[PDB]
Amino acid sequence: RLRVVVLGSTGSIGTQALQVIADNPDRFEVVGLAAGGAHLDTLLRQRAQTGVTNIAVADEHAAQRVGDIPYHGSDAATRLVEQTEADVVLNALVGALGLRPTLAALKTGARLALANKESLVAGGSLVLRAARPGQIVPVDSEHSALAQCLRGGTPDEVAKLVLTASGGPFRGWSAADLEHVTPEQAGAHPTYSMGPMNTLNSASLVNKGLEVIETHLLFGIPYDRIDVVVHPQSIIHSMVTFIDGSTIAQASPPDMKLPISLALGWPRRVSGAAAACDFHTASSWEFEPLDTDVFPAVELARQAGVAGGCMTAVYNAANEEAAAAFLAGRIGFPAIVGIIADVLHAADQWAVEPATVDDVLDAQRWARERAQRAVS
Amino acid sequence: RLRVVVLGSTGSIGTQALQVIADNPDRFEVVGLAAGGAHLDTLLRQRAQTGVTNIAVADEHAAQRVGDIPYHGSDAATRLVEQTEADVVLNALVGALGLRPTLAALKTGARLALANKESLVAGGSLVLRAARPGQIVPVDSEHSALAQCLRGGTPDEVAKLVLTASGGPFRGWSAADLEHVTPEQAGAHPTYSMGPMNTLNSASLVNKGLEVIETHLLFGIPYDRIDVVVHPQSIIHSMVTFIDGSTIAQASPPDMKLPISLALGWPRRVSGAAAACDFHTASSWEFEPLDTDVFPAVELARQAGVAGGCMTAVYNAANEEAAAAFLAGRIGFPAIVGIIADVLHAADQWAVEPATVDDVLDAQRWARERAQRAVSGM
Numbered sequence: 001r002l003r004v005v006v007l008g009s010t011g012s013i014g015t016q017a018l019q020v021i022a023d024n025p026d027r028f029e030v031v032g033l034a035a036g037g038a039h040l041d042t043l044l045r046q047r048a049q050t051g052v053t054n055i056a057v058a059d060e061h062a063a064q065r066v067g068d069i070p071y072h073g074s075d076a077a078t079r080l081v082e083q084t085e086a087d088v089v090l091n092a093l094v095g096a097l098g099l100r101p102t103l104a105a106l107k108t109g110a111r112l113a114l115a116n117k118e119s120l121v122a123g124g125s126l127v128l129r130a131a132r133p134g135q136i137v138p139v140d141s142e143h144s145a146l147a148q149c150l151r152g153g154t155p156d157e158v159a160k161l162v163l164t165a166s167g168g169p170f171r172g173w174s175a176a177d178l179e180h181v182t183p184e185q186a187g188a189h190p191t192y193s194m195g196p197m198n199t200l201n202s203a204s205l206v207n208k209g210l211e212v213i214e215t216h217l218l219f220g221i222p223y224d225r226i227d228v229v230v231h232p233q234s235i236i237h238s239m240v241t242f243i244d245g246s247t248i249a250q251a252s253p254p255d256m257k258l259p260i261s262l263a264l265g266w267p268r269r270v271s272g273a274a275a276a277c278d279f280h281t282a283s284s285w286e287f288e289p290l291d292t293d294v295f296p297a298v299e300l301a302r303q304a305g306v307a308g309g310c311m312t313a314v315y316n317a318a319n320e321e322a323a324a325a326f327l328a329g330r331i332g333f334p335a336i337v338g339i340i341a342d343v344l345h346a347a348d349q350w351a352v353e354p355a356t357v358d359d360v361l362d363a364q365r366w367a368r369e370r371a372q373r374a375v376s
Numbered sequence: 377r378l379r380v381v382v383l384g385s386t387g388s389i390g391t392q393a394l395q396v397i398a399d400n401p402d403r404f405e406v407v408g409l410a411a412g413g414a415h416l417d418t419l420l421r422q423r424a425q426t427g428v429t430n431i432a433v434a435d436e437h438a439a440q441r442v443g444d445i446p447y448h449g450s451d452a453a454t455r456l457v458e459q460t461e462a463d464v465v466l467n468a469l470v471g472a473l474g475l476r477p478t479l480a481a482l483k484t485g486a487r488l489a490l491a492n493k494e495s496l497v498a499g500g501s502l503v504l505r506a507a508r509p510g511q512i513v514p515v516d517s518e519h520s521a522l523a524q525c526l527r528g529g530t531p532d533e534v535a536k537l538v539l540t541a542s543g544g545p546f547r548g549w550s551a552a553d554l555e556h557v558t559p560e561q562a563g564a565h566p567t568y569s570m571g572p573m574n575t576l577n578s579a580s581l582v583n584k585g586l587e588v589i590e591t592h593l594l595f596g597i598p599y600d601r602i603d604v605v606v607h608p609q610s611i612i613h614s615m616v617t618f619i620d621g622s623t624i625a626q627a628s629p630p631d632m633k634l635p636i637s638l639a640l641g642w643p644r645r646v647s648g649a650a651a652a653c654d655f656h657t658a659s660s661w662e663f664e665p666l667d668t669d670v671f672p673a674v675e676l677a678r679q680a681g682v683a684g685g686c687m688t689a690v691y692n693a694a695n696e697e698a699a700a701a702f703l704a705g706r707i708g709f710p711a712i713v714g715i716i717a718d719v720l721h722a723a724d725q726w727a728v729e730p731a732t733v734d735d736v737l738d739a740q741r742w743a744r745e746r747a748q749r750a751v752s753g754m
């Protein structure tokens with residue numbers, strides 16, 4: 001029975017994870033929860049249902065309202081990870097703020113079931129140096145797919161890793177069409193129900209950019225051998241092409257419970273985690289290229305990744321600041337990626353490899369401040 | 377450098393295999409060829425291109441025209457296999473006549489790269505009992521796909537095997553429409569260029585039936601956990617569904633050189649064997665149910681397989697006889713599968729495991745006579 005800490009338990013991934021665990025008592029047990037404090041009703045229900053009071057709440061006043069909270073403050077999640085015996089830490093926090101808990105999870109020796117891609121993108125080589133082989137297991141569906149498909153050959157036989165992208169609500173739209181996009185319109189993802197950040201990032205295509213960096217970091221494949229194809233149904237979750245011309249693909253109706261279940265149970269599958277494809281009804285899986293002129297977020301992510309060092313932290317931190325500005329009505333939708341480009345292209349000093357967490361934090365601070373100057 | 381014997385070298389698969397070997401002289405060497413004698417100019421070219429004089433030709437007269445052929449007559453292919461040192465025998469013969477070469481190959485201890493699915497369908501447990509694990513490696517694209525996708529879990533984690541079928545030229549047709557099918561129409565496959573028999577069988581859906589039996593025999597998955605789905609593009613070659621709900625699929629533009637190369641090179645992939653999927657232009661992969669009312673060949677294959685023993689030899693033999701009658705204008709297209717069903721339903725005695733090859737041969741003889749009896753009544 002694996003002991004699981006769930007960071008960001010009240011969120012989209014976190015709540016789906018608690019459901020998988022609730023359905024599988026003989027294999028998993030919750031031993032800790034962390035949240036921000038914005039959803040106390042959810043947190044209350046989760047405390048009662050799991051019987052776990054080992055909980056972190058970032059916001060101090062929220063922690064007082066809910067009562068009986070052992071860790072509060074901006075370091076509460078990190079402290080929780082440091083002070084809880086666990087076999088798996090499921091990091092489902094949102095944003096680069098997942099960085100210290102990610103580093104702490106790796107130091108404990110526990111498996112890190114990583115949903116919080118921003119922590120790996122920001123940490124880069126610093127997070128890789130803190131992990132042992134196989135210690136980080138991806139929850140993100142593309143990387144879960146890739147890990148499964150890589151069982152299909154030897155390392156020297158892999159040609160390309162191919163990520164699928166839904167294309168978002170604005171698939172096929174012109175650059176001009178993006179001008180008057182509202183937060184409401186950006187909020188309507190075609191295939192997944194998610195928190196507001198991954199929703200916005202999937203609309204701007206920054207999510208797929210983050211995922212290209214995540215792919216390079218997790219699997220050690222060169223950027224030039226990572227492809228991205230737009231697949232509107234989000235049924236094929238990604239695929240691997242081998243040197244003989246064969247492709248192996250992983251597929252299922254979009255439901256994050258499946259990759260969540262596998263990250264927890266790895267390498268053993270979890271019976272009944274999610275519905276399989278049903279071929280008793282006619283259907284079709286479509287594929288099309290991404291228009292890189294309209295959506296250059298992925299090319300920008302490749303540029304950031306190839307530069308390496310703290311540049312991937314810069315890419316993500318510029319996004320976090322610019323996205324927030326869009327959500328607040330201070331900038332238009334195209335300015336999100338426009339600001340990322342501007343910040344990235346001014347960031348040559350950050351191509352250096354981080355020695356400690358503080359180097360990544362510095363790079364992020366620099367990027368946010370510059371993005372903020374672009375906004376105003 | 378693997379020494380390969382290529383049976384059925386002048387055919388669709390055989391010619392494609394020779395090209396893969398030609399393109400990869402560091403990996404493979406042809407050391408034997410077998411053919412029927414119908415394509416002599418092809419065989420002349422192959423002898424010259426490979427430098428191999430170690431050749432079997434089934435038709436004696438044909439063998440004379442080629443000249444200098446060491447093995448000739450109906451057992452020529454089998455004798456070639458028994459007397460040629462090799463690492464891999466690629467059996468790309470067509471029909472149940474591939475049975476004795478398949479058994480002889482297994483006995484040599486060499487890998488059997490099996491394109492000739494009929495020999496396994498006919499031999500059933502007899503062929504399985506002749507083989508060691510990994511010794512039979514499928515050239516058939518569906519089974520090559522399944523083999524690859526099965527690397528994606530442990531055996532108890534497998535829920536279903538899902539085979540794709542092109543649907544053939546008559547996909548979507550009614551039973552009434554099928555009555556009017558000509559041999560010429562049934563010779564036009566949507567996705568693969570093949571010899572006449574697999575082309576016909578893919579149009580009648582008997583090919584998918586044979587492949588369902590082949591799946592059960594190769595992988596040990598029960599018939600009721602083998603699905604078939606119609607996929608008109610033939611890009612996804614087959615898929616495995618696991619107990620968590622995950623499906624793993626193998627895909628490529630249809631090109632038999634890919635599964636041929638893998639079967640020869642197993643478990644090592646052959647660089648550059650075939651083109652990969654390209655996503656630079658918009659495309660669609662479609663799936664739809666098979667119309668089992670109009671096309672019961674797969675259901676009848678399951679029935680035969682479930683019955684077991686010699687019943688799968690009966691299924692295939694009834695098809696070979698009925699198929700040839702349709703080609704000769706002796707019956708209409710729907711009567712192919714109609715005769716298969718009639719023969720199967722009278723075949724209760726053949727649901728016993730074959731002890732020897734002769735048991736299989738007896739069941740096949742019985743089945744052909746029964747099919748001919750049905751044919752002569754039409």
Ligand SMILES: NC(=O)C1=CN([C@@H]2O[C@H](COP(=O)(O)OP(=O)(O)OC[C@H]3O[C@@H](n4cnc5c(N)ncnc54)[C@H](OP(=O)(O)O)[C@@H]3O)[C@@H](O)[C@H]2O)C=CC1
Binds near residue numbers: 012117193256
């Ligand atoms: N949702 C999805 O399907 C997918 C998500 N991902 C990735 O998984 C991660 C989680 O995303 P998602 O579940 O959508 O996010 P949500 O916004 O739904 O959830 C965020 C979680 O983090 C908590 N949180 C927010 N700020 C803080 C803080 N300062 N300290 C501690 N906890 C905090 C929230 O708690 P509260 O709200 O209670 O304050 C909530 O539990 C993201 O990295 C995302 O990119 C990846 C692929 C798919």
Ligand SMILES: NC(=O)C1=CN([C@@H]2O[C@H](COP(=O)(O)OP(=O)(O)OC[C@H]3O[C@@H](n4cnc5c(N)ncnc54)[C@H](OP(=O)(O)O)[C@@H]3O)[C@@H](O)[C@H]2O)C=CC1
Binds near residue numbers: 412450467491517
């Ligand atoms: N073609 C394809 O893409 C696929 C084929 N297969 C299977 O592979 C096998 C071969 O199919 P395919 O290549 O299309 O068939 P073809 O009809 O194209 O080739 C048949 C081959 O067998 C030879 N042959 C015929 N009779 C005899 C005999 N009595 N003794 C020795 N050789 C003989 C023929 O020689 P000749 O013509 O010179 O007399 C020819 O070389 C079949 O079992 C088929 O179902 C499976 C999947 C795909």
Ligand SMILES: O=CN(O)CCCP(=O)(O)O
Binds near residue numbers: 141168192208
């Ligand atoms: O793994 C699942 N997701 O990343 C949800 C977002 C999918 P998209 O970025 O392709 O729209």
Ligand SMILES: O=CN(O)CCCP(=O)(O)O
Binds near residue numbers: 517540544568584
């Ligand atoms: O493996 C390849 N084939 O069997 C070619 C026939 C394809 P079909 O039976 O699905 O039409």
Ligand SMILES: [Mn+2]
Binds near residue numbers: 140141142
């Ligand atoms: Mn993802």
Ligand SMILES: [Mn+2]
Binds near residue numbers: 516517518587
């Ligand atoms: Mn086939």
